Amino acid sequence: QCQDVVQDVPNVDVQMLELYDRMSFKDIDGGVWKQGWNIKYDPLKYNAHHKLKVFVVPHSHNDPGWIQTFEEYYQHDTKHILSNALRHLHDNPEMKFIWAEISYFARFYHDLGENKKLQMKSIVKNGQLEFVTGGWVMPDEANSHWRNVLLQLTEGQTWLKQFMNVTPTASWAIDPFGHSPTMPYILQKSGFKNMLIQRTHYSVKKELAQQRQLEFLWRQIWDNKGDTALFTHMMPFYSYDIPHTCGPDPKVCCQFDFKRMGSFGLSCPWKVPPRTISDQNVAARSDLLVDQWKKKAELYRTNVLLIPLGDDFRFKQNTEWDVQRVNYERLFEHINSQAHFNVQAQFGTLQEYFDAVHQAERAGQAEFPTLSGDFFTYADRSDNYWSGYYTSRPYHKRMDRVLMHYVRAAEMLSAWHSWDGMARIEERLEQARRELSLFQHHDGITGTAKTHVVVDYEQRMQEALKACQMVMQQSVYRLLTKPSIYSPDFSFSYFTLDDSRWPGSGVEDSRTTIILGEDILPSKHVVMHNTLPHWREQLVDFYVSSPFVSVTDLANNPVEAQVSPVWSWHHDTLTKTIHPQGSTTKYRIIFKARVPPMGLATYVLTISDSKPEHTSYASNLLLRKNPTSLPLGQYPEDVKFGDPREISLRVGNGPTLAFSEQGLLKSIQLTQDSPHVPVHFKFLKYGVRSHGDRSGAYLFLPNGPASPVELGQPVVLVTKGKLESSVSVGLPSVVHQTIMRGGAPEIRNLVDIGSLDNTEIVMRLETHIDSGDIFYTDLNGLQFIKRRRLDKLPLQANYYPIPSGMFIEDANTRLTLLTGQPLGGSSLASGELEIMQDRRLASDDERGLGQGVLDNKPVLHIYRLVLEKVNNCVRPSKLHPAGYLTSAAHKASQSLLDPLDKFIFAENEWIGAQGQFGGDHPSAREDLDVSVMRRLTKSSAKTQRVGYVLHRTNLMQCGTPEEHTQKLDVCHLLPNVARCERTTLTFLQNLEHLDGMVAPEVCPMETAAYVSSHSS
């Protein structure tokens, strides 16, 4: 059956949390290998019967945006690199080259004439040009959601299968800023056999090199058996450039980068240039080079050595191809003919290296260690920890999560039908997938690109959101209209989307008001979509032009509703206060929507002359000295005023929350009899150092612990309703809101750092939970990993990515904070959690960007805050490196990432309207998700195919009885199934033909893919 992911601590040779606890991290001068030691080798190790096999692997690192946009780099650099690679590889049969970024390759290939397309296919088929990874990009591993890592992998590999007839099984990741085990998890389930990484902490490189543990079988932290393991090669040195890839001494290796002699505008900072290889110098030059190679080889276990040969946007000019190739050819000819070296060297590809390593392994020449854990937080030198980019450009980090959900919902809603080509569904979805995939780049979501490049990514994502909206609204109109009435114009807007949290109140005025009136329109249809495979209830809200509005379902049953004002916050430059203003013509109506699994539900909003029977009205209380009136038009309850004071609120039977006179949470009481548990929100600021290294887009280099934000006497607004209550406060740089709907509260921060140079704003929670030095953070929204604060490392080293959540706990109590956007955070003291909101930095931090971060804009960050008793939960033992969410915390995360979608009918009358779609869909167990539903065939295919990715998380057992749910068989969701296959996660290879056309559910922590085939 399924592996137990909770109760069995895996036995591994290297466990990264344990390694961290033991290591001293001393930054000593190691000599020419500045962060290592003087490597020694026995010249007699290699001989006639045991030679060192060396593969020199030419490469070119091509960023899809960084200092220039994607299109700018394509025009100025990449198109020339690819054109000259085609010519030079065609003309020189022994030359080799690897390529990673399929976004660029697809852009190039589609512009080639047919003759050159054929030449290109031939150099791929014969093994000269080899694709590595084959993703659209080389993604960030810290901020990216696993769903989007899979999306971009699939986009690149699907293109490669169709046009190049290849599927890479070796991955190459030389530039992301630290590395996540989410990568081998996805890769191993997508047919991969090997992977390579580079950016790991210099102290980790030294420690693993000393033990020859730089090649390892990387398994997941919970995996007892080892079925998830993927062979991994970690590079040993400071960079992927030529000076740091031939061996330990960059002053020597730089002399073998033949682009650095002068005419290309490049030089060697160690002050010894390369020299052209000649018959008079080749013996001395070979002496030097082979010595570097044999030193590098000492760090690894086989007689097969990998020597990358490349750098950023290399291999651009014909003269560069010639200068590298001819000089290396002269070296190979000498070395391979001199028996005393006992070396055979040649150009190679990445797969050729790994194939030779495993041949050596099978011959019994080496065994490899097992490893679990991650490689965050990275430092490349001294105290320069790269935790800044966990937060940089937070507006676009939030946008990533919004678009993630819109892509999923658009692909799912449109998958139910086959569409005519005239509907442009495939076209719009391909655009949306490619723009989101592009943004996964390690200069996209990371917030590490130049200002105009960030603007390009934003514009691309906005076009993607519009594409998703078009596809979603056409799909809803088709799914909910009587078939013999349905009459689509594929360019028309039948519905508009309403989104309450993006761009958000105070960020953009983007939401449409539903206009009703006795002399214009009495009522309006709205529709909710639920992408999750279980029945779901959620409060939804709409703007309406009257407070006298009632809600009905499509059987005309009344639905209880609440009306509240529309409140907007203003920085009043006259009075120098931050305060709310209410609308006198627009109101919010709020009601509970109930929606089938993967389904739709229709409701109707109707105006009346006076207060409706089933609609209530919130009270409003403004707490401030020196109040002035706040008129609200037709709204039936007058606003009340008071001096600042402590207050308490409770919605339904849920928790009771207490707030300070500054409008910030101070305690949570779970039930009527229970204690008021101290839980305090506080805002603080970090600064920048006045001497030494400065914080920038990459680096977090604080000038000591954070200092409290001076709050003054802020204005607090309290709204109290039967369905929803809230407390909002206008603080310097942040409008902070706590919202209560009967369960764990929602927190929203409208963050505007303004002109506060050299400031990072942090949100901290203070509790009395006895967590000590332990906390938990997630990796890519997929898994929670145990962290240990280490006082032997600086503050910035204790910051980790918070891509979707974090928690602290003791024997009895847990506090979990879930996020709707990736940000950086930590627990710097027992009982605390903190998460960075935004950062504005005037200085460049010397990693090539050449600017600070001064382009901040208002962003609405969203969260859920879950306080729970955990004394009854079955948790992992003290030595287990993982943690797991409870049911309530998991559902709270889903409420942020995949909320209900809301659609407003755009015309006056919807002819043929229906009340529901998906009432007969199975309601699956709460830990199971249909992460992806995607139709894989166009309408002309006789046999239609639909792909599903199914993910089961693992939730803690805490004594809540399980109610029976229904089995979900994705292969029977569409009618007329003829075949069901288990596939790789990219859908590109069939792995299992399934009995009775039934797709089995997956085990906890597992992800599987299935494709159903249908007669059409």
Ligand X SMILES: CC(C)(C)c1ccc(C(=O)C[C@@H]2CC[C@@H](O)[C@@H]3[C@H](O)[C@H](O)CN23)cc1
Span 232-271, contacts to Zn ion by CB under 5 A: none
Query: Rounded CA gap, 1006 and 223, in Å?
Result: 11
Closer CB to Zn ion, residue 313 or residue 641?
313
Q: Give the residue carrying structure tokens 């906390």.
A: 775
How far is the CA of 689 from the CAs of 696, 795, 850, in angstroms? 11, 14, 19
Give dist(CA 814, CA 801) in Å, integer. 20
766 DSSP β-pair partners: 680, 832
175 is catalytic: yes
Out of 140, 175, 752, 838, pick the active-site residue: 175
* Interaction of residue 708 with ligand X, rule CB under 6 A: no
Contacts of 72 (CB under 8 A, 6+ apart): none
Contact 760, 196 (CB under 8 A): no
| Residue 380 found at the interface with Zn ion (CB under 5 A) | no
Residue 63 among known ligand-binding residues: yes
Rule CB under 6 A: say whether 560 interacts with ligand X. no
Nearer to ligand X, 63 or 834 (CB): 63
Considering the rule CB under 6 A, would residue 693 count as an interface residue with ligand X?
no
Q: Where are the alpha helices (DSSP H) in 343-450?
A: 350-362, 394-415, 425-439
- The site partner of 448 among Zn ion, ligand X, none (C-beta below 5 to 8 Å per kind) is ligand X
**Using CA atoms, how far apart are residues 816 and 889, in angstroms rounded to an integer?**
7
Here the tokens at position 914 are 């229906």
Q: Is 661 in the site for ligand X (CB under 6 A)?
A: no
Q: Which of 27, 312, 355, 463 binds ligand X (CB under 6 A)?
A: 312
Q: Which does 917 bind (CB under 5 to 8 A by kind): Zn ion, ligand X, none?
A: none
Of residues 199 and 529, the one with the C-beta less far from Zn ion: 199
Whether the CB-CB separation of 710 and 725 falls below 8 Å is answered with no
* Residue 902 makes contact with ligand X by CB under 6 A: no
Q: Does 700 bind ligand X (CB under 6 A)?
A: no
Closest to ligand X by CB, 77 vs 981, is 77
Pair 708, 684: CB distance under 8 Å: yes
Helical H segments across 110-246, by residue range: 114-125, 146-164, 182-188, 202-210
Which residue, 77 or 175, is less far from Zn ion as judged by CB? Answer: 175
Structure tokens at 278: 């000649």
Are 530 and 594 in contact by the 8 Å Cβ rule? The answer is no
Tell me if 175 contacts Zn ion by CB under 5 A.
Answer: yes
Is residue 72 a contact residue for ligand X (CB under 6 A)? no
Nearest to 99 by CA among 142, 136, 144, 52: 136
Tokens of 887: 């049911």
Residue 846 interacts with ligand X (CB under 6 A)?
yes
Q: Is 34 in the site for ligand X (CB under 6 A)?
A: no
Would the annotation count 175 as a binding residue?
yes
Q: Which stretch binds ligand X (CB under 6 A): 12-20, 146-154, 478-486, 843-851?
A: 843-851
* Binding span for ligand X by CB under 6 A among 146-154, 682-690, 812-820, 840-848: 840-848
- Of 12, 14, 53, 63, the one binding Zn ion by CB under 5 A: 63
442 is in an annotated binding site: yes
Give the residue with the Cβ less far from ligand X, 712 or 848: 848
Element (H, E) at 677: strand 677-686
Residue 445: CB minimum distance to ligand X, A = 12
Q: Which does 770 bind (CB under 5 to 8 A by kind): Zn ion, ligand X, none?
A: none
Contact call for residue 636 and ligand X (CB under 6 A): no
- By CB under 6 A, name the one of 66, 375, 390, 800 that touches ligand X: 66
CA 682 to chain centre: 27
Q: Which stretch binds Zn ion (CB under 5 A): 55-63, 377-385, 597-605, 859-867?
A: 55-63
Does residue 140 belong to the site contacting Zn ion (CB under 5 A)? no
Closer CB to ligand X, 328 or 389, in the complex: 389
In the list 144, 182, 448, 473, the residue contacting ligand X (rule: CB under 6 A) is 448
On whether the CB atoms of residues 783 and 221 are closer than 8 A, the answer is yes
**845 part of the interface to ligand X, by CB under 6 A:** no
Strands 215-218 and 370-372: parallel
CB of 380 to ligand X, least distance (A): 7
Scored b (16 or more CB within 10 A) or e, 735-749 reads bbbbbbbebbbbbbb
CA dihedral 74, 75, 77, 79 (to 10 degrees): 70
Cα 422 from chain centroid (whole Å): 34
Name the β-bridge partners of 765: 681, 833
Stretch that binds ligand X, among 328-336, 604-612, 749-757, 842-850 (CB under 6 A): 842-850
Q: In angstroms, give the least distance from the CB of 66 to Zn ion.
A: 6
CB of 61 to Zn ion, least distance (A): 6
Closest CA to 191 of 1012, 1011, 781, 1009: 1009
Task: Report the distance separating Cα 843 and Cα 729, nearest Å.
Answer: 32
User: Which residues on neighbouring strands pair with residue 336, listed in sequence order?
Assistant: none
With beta carbons less than 8 A apart as the criterion, state whether 170 and 350 touch: yes
Nearer to ligand X, 312 or 499 (CB): 312
Check binding of 63 to ligand X (CB under 6 A).
yes
61 binds ligand X (CB under 6 A): yes
CA 936/CA 402 separation, integer angstroms: 24
Least Å distance between CB 65 and Zn ion?
10
Residues that bind Zn ion (CB under 5 A): 63, 175
Q: Catalog residues that contact ligand X under the rule CB under 6 A.
A: 61, 63, 66, 175, 312, 442-443, 448, 846-848
Catalogue the active-site residues.
Answer: 175
Q: Which residues are annotated as a binding site for Zn(2+)?
A: 61, 63, 175, 442
Q: Detail the residues annotated as belonging to a binding site.
A: 61, 63, 175, 442
